[PDB]
Amino acid sequence: LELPADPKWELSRARLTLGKPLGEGCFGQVVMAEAIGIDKDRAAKPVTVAVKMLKDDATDKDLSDLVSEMEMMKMIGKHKNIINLLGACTQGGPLYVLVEYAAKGNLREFLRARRSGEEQLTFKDLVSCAYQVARGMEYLASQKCIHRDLAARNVLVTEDNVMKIADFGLARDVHNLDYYKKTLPVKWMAPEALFDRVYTHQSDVWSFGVLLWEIFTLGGSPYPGIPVEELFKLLKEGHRMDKPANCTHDLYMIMRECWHAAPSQRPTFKQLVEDLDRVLTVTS
Numbered sequence: 470l471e472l473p474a475d476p477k478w479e480l481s482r483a484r485l486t487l488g489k490p491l492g493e494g495c496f497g498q499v500v501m502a503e504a505i506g507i508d509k510d511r512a513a514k515p516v517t518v519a520v521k522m523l524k525d526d527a528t529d530k531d532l533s534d535l536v537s538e539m540e541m542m543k544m545i546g547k548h549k550n551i552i553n554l555l556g557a558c559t560q561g562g563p564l565y566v567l568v569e570y571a572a573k574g575n576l577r578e579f580l581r582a583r584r585s586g587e588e589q590l591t592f593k594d595l596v597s598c599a600y601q602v603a604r605g606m607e608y609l610a611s612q613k614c615i616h617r618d619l620a621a622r623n624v625l626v627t628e629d630n631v632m633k634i635a636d637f638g639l640a641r642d643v644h645n646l647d648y649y650k651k652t653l654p655v656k657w658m659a660p661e662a663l664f665d666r667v668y669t670h671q672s673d674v675w676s677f678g679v680l681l682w683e684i685f686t687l688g689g690s691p692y693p694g695i696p697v698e699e700l701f702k703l704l705k706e707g708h709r710m711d712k713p714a715n716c717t718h719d720l721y722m723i724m725r726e727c728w729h730a731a732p733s734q735r736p737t738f739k740q741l742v743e744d745l746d747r748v749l750t751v752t753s
């Protein structure tokens with residue numbers, strides 16, 4: 470693979486050992502791996518990382534897309550609540566892009582597994598998740614970045630229970646079809662993004678509202694049972710999801726504010742961080 474080497478990011482292949490594919494879906498693209506020297510404090514320690522790689526039969530677009538996503542992560546910079554770029558192997562072999570490893574999977578599965586048992590999460594723990602996703606989104610918005618698909622599936626949880634937004638630098642095709650027919654992204658989409666293909670940081674705020682509903686339903690499916698045809702009618706008429714059973718009134722007003730039809734009437738991510746911060750303080 471003929472590519473330029475960015476020395477400050479280049480990792481030696483001797484330091485990387487590839488492991489098992491992560492997740493059953495899209496297998497082979499993302500694998501678990503160990504990288505020695507990633508932690509500046511412990512040079513000898515192998516650090517578990519996630520490695521994105523191309524398929525054996527990949528197109529030149531697939532390669533350019535992966536390089537562009539890596540390059541956009543370099544521009545955006547690092548934040549605790551986003552999946553960060555750790556390095557890359559671009560010379561003398563196949564392209565490997567290293568990102569932070571999230572042991573506890575995506576937020577939806579993390580919540581569904583912790584609906585019952587000892588690992589069951591408290592109200593404060595669920596508010597902490599919302600605050601961390603809002604913090605990471607505030608940073609991405611400040612760096613001129615629009616996620617376009619903010620949902621629990623695209624938020625990964627570390628072994629230390631840190632929330633990290635994933636695939637933010639990823640370029641997504643606006644529409645698979647008017648009705649995608651894959652037979653779900655439309656439930657998280659704002660009305661302007663869904664009907665007019667308009668994406669702003671305020672459309673991500675609508676998606677954050679749907680994500681907040683996921684958090685307090687512990688990984689619940691938004692608008693359950695409602696077909697896509699009926700969903701378009703319901704949103705145009707002003708109908709919104711009901712308050713999750715284990716959710717406070719003040720938090721449901723934050724959700725209800727994210728779902729204003731007028732984008733500017735929704736709060737900014739700076740304001741959502743501030744609203745979720747006050748919810749964490751009041752509990753004492």
Ligand SMILES: *CCC(=O)N1C[C@@H](n2nc(C#Cc3c(F)cc4c(ncn4C4CC4)c3F)c(C(N)=O)c2NC)C[C@@H]1COC
Pocket residue numbers: 491492493494495496498499500519520521535538539542552566568569570571572574575625635636637638
């Ligand atoms: C196709 C794999 C997939 O959808 N999975 C597997 C599981 N999972 N994926 C991730 C990840 C990641 C990752 C990536 F590989 C590359 C990437 C990311 N941001 C940007 N970059 C591009 C290269 C520059 C990114 F988040 C993880 C992690 N990281 O722990 C896991 N853990 C499990 C689940 C997910 C969904 O499966 C249905």
